[PDB]
Amino acid sequence: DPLRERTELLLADYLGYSAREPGTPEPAPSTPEAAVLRSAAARLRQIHRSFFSAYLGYPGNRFELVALMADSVLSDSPGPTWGRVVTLVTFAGTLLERGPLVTAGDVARDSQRLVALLSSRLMGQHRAWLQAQGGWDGFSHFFRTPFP
């Protein structure tokens, strides 16, 4: 599915960025939605710095953790929203980050596994919901909403 492939590219872009070697140049966003997701994720982490900073050097099983929560976070009432989608994806990205302050092959496979997991959850039970929102263009429009 083109919608599946577009979804997989978005998650690969963001999680790949999250997993990258510390101190290397930031890869340019591959699509508009990739740039929006990166910006939204950054704002979310700023707002909830203490919550996300706590998982930043997460030494445990990264895939297991996200796999245990992916369905409820997306599904549970009120239901799926773009806010939830960004939050779950941002959380997954946080688990993958490394760097000098944090430390104070494996990452590659984990990011691949998370791309596959999250794509499947989105294209699985919430596919209809995603299409009704206008797909990833809807996503981009949603978070570009002008502010006061």
């Binding site: 979310l44 707002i47 909830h48 919550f51 953790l65 245990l68 929560m69 409820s72 976070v73 549970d76 009120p78 929203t81 773009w82 806010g83 939830r84 989608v85 960004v86 939050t87 779950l88 959380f91 949603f142 978070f143 909403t145 002008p146 502010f147």
Partner: peptide, 24 residues
Amino acid sequence: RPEIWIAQELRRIGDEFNAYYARR
């Protein structure tokens, strides 16, 4: 089962974040 609690916070965080953009 710690996943149940973290999922809870991720859910709250996401719903709040969504509300900032919902509509405006």
